[PDB]
Amino acid sequence: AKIRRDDEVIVLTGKDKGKRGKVKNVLSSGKVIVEGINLVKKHQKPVPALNQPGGIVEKEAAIQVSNVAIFNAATGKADRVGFRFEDGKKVRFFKSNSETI
Amino acid sequence: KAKELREKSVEELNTELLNLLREQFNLRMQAASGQLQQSHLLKQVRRDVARVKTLLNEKAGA
Amino acid sequence: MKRTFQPSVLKRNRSHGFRARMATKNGRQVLARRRAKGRARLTVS
Amino acid sequence: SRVCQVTGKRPVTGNNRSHALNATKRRFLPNLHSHRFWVESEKRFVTLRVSAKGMRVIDKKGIDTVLAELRARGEKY
Amino acid sequence: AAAAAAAAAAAAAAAAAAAAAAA
Amino acid sequence: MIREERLLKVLRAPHVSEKASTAMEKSNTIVLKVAKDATKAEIKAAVQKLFEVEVEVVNTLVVKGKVKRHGQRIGRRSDWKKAYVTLKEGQNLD
RNA sequence: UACGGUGCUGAAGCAACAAAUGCCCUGCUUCCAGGAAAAGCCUCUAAGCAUCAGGUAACAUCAAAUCGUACCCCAAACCG
RNA sequence: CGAAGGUGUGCUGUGAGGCAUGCUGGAGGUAUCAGAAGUGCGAAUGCUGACAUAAGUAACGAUAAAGCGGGUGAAAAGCCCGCUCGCCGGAAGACCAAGGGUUCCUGUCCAACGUUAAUCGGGGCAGGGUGAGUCGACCCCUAAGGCGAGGCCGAAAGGCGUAGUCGAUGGGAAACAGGUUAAUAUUCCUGUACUUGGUGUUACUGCGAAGGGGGGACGGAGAAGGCUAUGUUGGCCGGGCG
RNA sequence: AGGACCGAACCGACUAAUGUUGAAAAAUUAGCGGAUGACUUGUGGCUGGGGGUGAAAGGCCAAUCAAACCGGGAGAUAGCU
RNA sequence: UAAGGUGAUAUGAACCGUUAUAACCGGCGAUUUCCGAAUGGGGAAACCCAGUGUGUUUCGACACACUAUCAUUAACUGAAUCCAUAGGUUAAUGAGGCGAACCGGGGGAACUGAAACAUCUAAGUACCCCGAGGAAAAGAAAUCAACCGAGAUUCCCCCAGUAGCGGCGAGCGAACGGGGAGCAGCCCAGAGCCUGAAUCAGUGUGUGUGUUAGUGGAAGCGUCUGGAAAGGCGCGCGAUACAGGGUGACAGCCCCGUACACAAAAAUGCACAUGCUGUGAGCUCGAUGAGUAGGGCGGGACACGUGGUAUCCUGUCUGAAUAUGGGGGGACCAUCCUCCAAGGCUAAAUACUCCUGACUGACCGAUAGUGAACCAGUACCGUGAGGGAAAGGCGAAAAGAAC
Ligand SMILES: [Mg+2]
Ligand SMILES: [Mg+2]
Ligand SMILES: [Mg+2]
Ligand SMILES: [Mg+2]
Ligand SMILES: [Mg+2]
Ligand SMILES: [Mg+2]
Ligand SMILES: [Mg+2]
Ligand SMILES: [Mg+2]
Ligand SMILES: [Mg+2]
Ligand SMILES: [Mg+2]
Ligand SMILES: [Mg+2]
Ligand SMILES: [Mg+2]
Ligand SMILES: [Mg+2]
Ligand SMILES: [Mg+2]
Ligand SMILES: [Mg+2]
Ligand SMILES: [Mg+2]
Ligand SMILES: [Mg+2]
Ligand SMILES: [Mg+2]
Ligand SMILES: [Mg+2]
Ligand SMILES: [Mg+2]
Ligand SMILES: [Mg+2]
Ligand SMILES: [Mg+2]
Ligand SMILES: [Mg+2]
Ligand SMILES: [Mg+2]
Ligand SMILES: [Mg+2]
Ligand SMILES: [Mg+2]
Ligand SMILES: [Mg+2]
Ligand SMILES: [Mg+2]
Ligand SMILES: [Mg+2]
Ligand SMILES: [Mg+2]
Ligand SMILES: [Mg+2]
Ligand SMILES: [Mg+2]
Ligand SMILES: [Mg+2]
Ligand SMILES: [Mg+2]
Ligand SMILES: [Mg+2]
Ligand SMILES: [Mg+2]
Ligand SMILES: [Mg+2]
Ligand SMILES: [Mg+2]
Ligand SMILES: [Mg+2]
Ligand SMILES: [Mg+2]
Ligand SMILES: [Mg+2]
Ligand SMILES: [Mg+2]
Ligand SMILES: [Mg+2]
Ligand SMILES: [Mg+2]
Ligand SMILES: [Mg+2]
Ligand SMILES: [Mg+2]
Ligand SMILES: [Mg+2]
Ligand SMILES: [Mg+2]
Ligand SMILES: [Mg+2]
Ligand SMILES: [Mg+2]
Ligand SMILES: [Mg+2]
Ligand SMILES: [Mg+2]
Ligand SMILES: [Mg+2]
Ligand SMILES: [Mg+2]
Ligand SMILES: [Mg+2]
Ligand SMILES: [Mg+2]
Ligand SMILES: [Mg+2]
Ligand SMILES: [Mg+2]
Ligand SMILES: [Mg+2]
Ligand SMILES: [Mg+2]
Ligand SMILES: [Mg+2]
Ligand SMILES: [Mg+2]
Ligand SMILES: [Mg+2]
Ligand SMILES: [Mg+2]
Ligand SMILES: [Mg+2]
Ligand SMILES: [Mg+2]
Ligand SMILES: [Mg+2]
Ligand SMILES: [Mg+2]
Ligand SMILES: [Mg+2]
Ligand SMILES: [Mg+2]
Ligand SMILES: [Mg+2]
Ligand SMILES: [Mg+2]
Ligand SMILES: [Mg+2]
Ligand SMILES: [Mg+2]
């Protein structure tokens, strides 16, 4: 897998191309959840137990993993991340300027 | 934990099995009632009594 | 009137049960025709 | 069954043809008897479900050679 | 829920003649 | 002598009902939910050994499970066994 | 007193008659169309076993397992 | 900056047709010349789905029969409660086997089901509920019969059948009374019991069968006697003086 | 005493009416025959298709019988619609 | 391999895990309830009842293992019987059951066509049964041919719808010969003497190859439309990769890939390098498959229906020679030609797909394609064999409508 959990990504399409943010957790099918960018206004119908109030909450919903790319801060662009065997231990590296994360 | 469970004697593995079973019975009688919030302990003791019985089965006869 | 199915599970299992199918020769081809057909219950029993 | 215990003569099938060539199916049955054969190397009697050509082939050979062939064929004679 | 209790109409059983026949 | 892991495997639950509570108070009978293939002597030995309580006699029956309809597909709940273990005269066990 | 209940007390509690297809009856009388089988159970012994085992009159002590026990059952629940 | 498809119009072709466009639709379509066909529907008492028609017509399923008040609700002819009325009473009452399989009981909802309404239900949902030494199966024993090691027979399959082994609707040990649950009770609780086995202790000595024998062990009809269930009458106790 | 008598259970099914797309793919009502026998019925067994069984009607064999039902030969064949 | 997982409707609490004992995937093990050939006895499949031996026992009993039937052989025994014999007691060694089609064998129809029907056809077809294998059968001339010559078997194309068979009707229909695929030949019928060399079968160490996890894997931006660009506009780059599938509208350059280049501790199919255990090639002399070939009768297969009918198989009766002998050469006879039955074994080409992968479709796109795009041989019907449906689509993402 390329787009891991920690790294600040920049999106490439959607209603908010040109925005960016961190990554919270990646789902199974390949839909990551980014730090508050493709937010949705989920209406909430309440519950007596379980402690939920009930209202419009503007949480974040998913965005597909082939629309995010790692924010190459050494140039400011987005950059496709390739892989390399180092010390017997496969790690990531960029393509523009070729540094290793 | 089977690395250390190889490194016990046969009767010590038997007694480990029996005390694991007493833990499993007390967790069973607790989770029958409203007495369990740590729910993963059931799965933990069940997998570990499987491991202890496996190591009995591979010691005795081999 | 008196209809033509007076159910009795003794006669039912004794004439259409699995062992009463398994005993004969074209009874074992009855069970092997339903397994290839893939049915839910092979016989009554 | 109807088997010559010496020569293995099974009942074969054929057609009764009529004079007007109407055909029907029939079973040629081998001529069987139950003869009791005297051996010497066992010094006793032994029965056989023999045919008449079986009695003639045992007349030709001798019964002990035929019993050797029958036990090599593997049957309780 | 949604039971949808609409099974197909298997209706026709048999017949007979049973009529005064012109002959 | 019964196997100790067998006596640890037999008892599965207690039972929680109005009849169970009234039978616990008026007759000193605990009501248990036991394994499917248990028997009377094994249940009596297990209830004397695990809870460490003197036990007179045991009364077992087999509850037939219901047939429910979850969603739209029909299904069978699993049968089990219920056991009225009485206790000795003047002996507490919760 | 939650009108649903619930606890303590509680007298008389006999006699005569009638009487069944049920019991004695797996009996008795009678007829011919001549009216299941094997184990329980009682008893005799051959083998053998030789005062060992066993048997039987007790006496104490332990057990009696598993399964069906809801409900309808001349029907709104079985067969139509 | 809107494809197929759908719906409208206008033009045009000798006809099957074609083109342009407005609306709906929201992602595919395909010139030209050739090629291959599951290539054209109005009829087959054609096949499947949908919707008519008769028509808001027949019918609402025993000619045992209902009426009133009070409760519940948004809503009572049908539900709950009370008061009357009617019907069965060798059944339209009670206990079962076969059979069904949670319909039994509580709480909740009335979408569908109920030949109508429904707060009701044998409907949906969640929970509860069946307690056996003595009842019945399981067990021991066999009937008609079934399978049937060997065997006999049979192109093969297999058919028959002995030892056997299964097969109840029959034979074989033992529990009744009273009380409780919303739901079990000859099962739970109280009282009083009884049966078959092991074990061990005391006394006594011929025990033992795959056997021999007794018994188990047996029809139809009738007739009488003794009784009992059970009822009626009196007494006795308690209530009553309309 | 009896394949005796009158008559309920129980077995039937003789007449009439009602239904006949019914309450019911043979029933209800009012009468009717037998009702200690060649009776009737519970439960289990047996006989298999040119075969069974039949107090005999070509009847009955799962609402079907001058030769059942299910699959296969099989898209039988059809000078016919 | 690994930073994310605790299978799906299916969210939730509870957790585990981030440098490699979380999870995921492959190899090998262990557990493997009950029914099922069921195999300890039984049986209304998923249940009841055991007995023997070994243990432990708080004497209440639990735990373990065993126990079917036949075929073969081994020992023990052991009847009427005298030895003996059957029989019985164990012991091992195997089989049993399932499975689509293909193969060989044992049985074997009828509708139908003949414009009717009986010979015939349908057809040795459907079907029943037995047996074995990944192939099976056949197979090494008692075969052809024609005075030349070929030198197993099987399969394909021709010969040829010819020669024939035929109530001479309906129809059935070769072969000789030639082109191809592939080509492999040996042994017991028995003794001496070389005396272990060719050889195959079975058991193993090493190489290589293939499978069961996998890893790397190129190259793009700015703008207008738009909800969103993969679209239009301009401008670049990769390409042994422009096969494909996604991605908020059509992407070689966003992702997964493919091309290519590698990787397996372990089991492993195979080519073997080759050790081990059985195994003997090799030489000479001899032997040349008997109730058999033929014959009478009755049938069957060859294209061949008794016809002038060769040849092959046998239900029955019969019955030789045996290398100077015999079979055949399409009645039969004489010369000639050729070949040596009555005992075996044998690879390949060929038939098939219940399956396991990759790939393609002038194949279908929900009344189609399997019956089945879905929790289908399910609901349901039938006592039972069996019969047997309907039923896909919100969106891009539930943002599934707070109030
Ligand atoms: Mg993308
Ligand atoms: Mg069925
Ligand atoms: Mg014929
Ligand atoms: Mg019980
Ligand atoms: Mg009851
Ligand atoms: Mg538009
Ligand atoms: Mg189109
Ligand atoms: Mg259009
Ligand atoms: Mg498309
Ligand atoms: Mg027309
Ligand atoms: Mg039409
Ligand atoms: Mg209509
Ligand atoms: Mg209308
Ligand atoms: Mg009208
Ligand atoms: Mg009118
Ligand atoms: Mg009306
Ligand atoms: Mg009514
Ligand atoms: Mg009315
Ligand atoms: Mg009222
Ligand atoms: Mg009313
Ligand atoms: Mg009255
Ligand atoms: Mg009643
Ligand atoms: Mg229900
Ligand atoms: Mg009720
Ligand atoms: Mg209720
Ligand atoms: Mg309403
Ligand atoms: Mg209604
Ligand atoms: Mg209900
Ligand atoms: Mg009793
Ligand atoms: Mg018995
Ligand atoms: Mg018998
Ligand atoms: Mg038999
Ligand atoms: Mg046998
Ligand atoms: Mg009985
Ligand atoms: Mg009895
Ligand atoms: Mg009740
Ligand atoms: Mg009790
Ligand atoms: Mg006796
Ligand atoms: Mg009598
Ligand atoms: Mg009295
Ligand atoms: Mg009085
Ligand atoms: Mg007065
Ligand atoms: Mg009379
Ligand atoms: Mg009447
Ligand atoms: Mg009378
Ligand atoms: Mg027939
Ligand atoms: Mg007639
Ligand atoms: Mg009929
Ligand atoms: Mg016929
Ligand atoms: Mg047709
Ligand atoms: Mg045909
Ligand atoms: Mg999940
Ligand atoms: Mg068994
Ligand atoms: Mg038994
Ligand atoms: Mg068995
Ligand atoms: Mg014919
Ligand atoms: Mg004909
Ligand atoms: Mg014809
Ligand atoms: Mg072969
Ligand atoms: Mg040869
Ligand atoms: Mg020559
Ligand atoms: Mg990769
Ligand atoms: Mg790449
Ligand atoms: Mg779109
Ligand atoms: Mg020769
Ligand atoms: Mg010879
Ligand atoms: Mg001969
Ligand atoms: Mg001959
Ligand atoms: Mg000849
Ligand atoms: Mg001949
Ligand atoms: Mg010849
Ligand atoms: Mg010639
Ligand atoms: Mg559609
Ligand atoms: Mg379909």
From Swiss-Prot, chain A:
Cellular component terms per the entry's GO annotation: cytoplasm; cytosol; cytosolic large ribosomal subunit
Entry-linked InterPro entries: KOW, Rib_uL2_dom2, Ribosomal_uL24, Ribosomal_uL24_CS, Ribosomal_uL24_KOW, Translation_prot_SH3-like_sf
A GO term, aspect molecular function: large ribosomal subunit rRNA binding
Keywords: Ribonucleoprotein, Ribosomal protein, RNA-binding, rRNA-binding
UniProt KW Kinase keyword: no
Family the entry assigns: Belongs to the universal ribosomal protein uL24 family.
Role: One of two assembly initiator proteins, it binds directly to the 5'-end of the 23S rRNA, where it nucleates assembly of the 50S subunit. It is not thought to be involved in the functions of the mature 50S subunit in vitro.
Complexes and interactors: Part of the 50S ribosomal subunit. Might contact the SecYEG translocation complex when it is docked with the ribosome.
HAMAP family, sorted: Ribosomal_uL24_B
Full protein name: Large ribosomal subunit protein uL24
Curated annotation (Swiss-Prot), chain B:
Coiled coil: none
InterPro entries per record: Ribosomal_protein_uL29, Ribosomal_uL29, Ribosomal_uL29_CS, Ribosomal_uL29_sf
SUPFAM superfamilies linked: Ribosomal protein L29 (L29p)
A cellular component annotation (GO) from this entry: cytoplasm
Keyword Magnesium on entry: no
One Pfam family cited in the UniProt record for this chain: Ribosomal_L29
Effect of a null allele: Cells missing both S17 and L29 grow very slowly and have a rather unstable temperature-sensitive phenotype.
Keyword Zinc: no
Alphabetical keyword list: Ribonucleoprotein, Ribosomal protein, RNA-binding, rRNA-binding
An example molecular function term from Gene Ontology annotations: structural constituent of ribosome
GO BP term, example: cytoplasmic translation
Family matches, as CDD domains: Ribosomal_L29_HIP
Family: Belongs to the universal ribosomal protein uL29 family.
Subunit structure: Part of the 50s ribosomal subunit. Contacts protein L23, trigger factor and protein nascent chains. Might also contact SecE and probably does contact SecG when the SecYEG translocation complex is docked with the ribosome.
Function: Binds 23S rRNA. It is not essential for growth. One of the proteins that surrounds the polypeptide exit tunnel on the outside of the subunit. Contacts trigger factor.
Protein name: Large ribosomal subunit protein uL29
Organism listed in the record: Escherichia coli (strain K12)
Gene that specifies this protein: rpmC
From Swiss-Prot, chain C:
Family matches, as NCBIfam families: rpmH_bact
GO MF annotation terms: structural constituent of ribosome
Alphabetical GO biological process terms: cytoplasmic translation
PROSITE patterns: RIBOSOMAL_L34
Similarity comment text for this entry: Belongs to the bacterial ribosomal protein bL34 family.
Subunit annotation: Part of the 50S ribosomal subunit.
Protein's name in the database: Large ribosomal subunit protein bL34
Gene name tied to this protein: rpmH
Originating organism: Escherichia coli (strain K12)
Record keywords, A-Z: Ribonucleoprotein, Ribosomal protein
Gene3D superfamilies: 1.10.287.3980
Domain of life assignment: Bacteria
From Swiss-Prot, chain D:
GO cellular component: cytoplasm; cytosol; cytosolic large ribosomal subunit
Keyword rRNA-binding among record annotations: yes
GO molecular function: rRNA binding; structural constituent of ribosome
An annotated GO BP: ribosomal large subunit assembly
InterPro entries named in the record: Ribosomal_bL28, Ribosomal_bL28/bL31-like_sf, Ribosomal_bL28_bact-type, Ribosomal_bL28_sf
Pfam family for this entry, one: Ribosomal_L28
Gene3D superfamilies in the cross-refs: Ribosomal protein L28/L24
Keyword entries, A-Z: Ribonucleoprotein, Ribosomal protein, RNA-binding, rRNA-binding
Keyword Ribonucleoprotein: yes
NCBIfam families linked to this entry: L28
HAMAP family: Ribosomal_bL28
Subunit text: Part of the 50S ribosomal subunit.
Family from the record: Belongs to the bacterial ribosomal protein bL28 family.
Protein name (record): Large ribosomal subunit protein bL28
Upper classification of the organism: Bacteria, Pseudomonadati, Pseudomonadota, Gammaproteobacteria, Enterobacterales
GN (gene name): rpmB
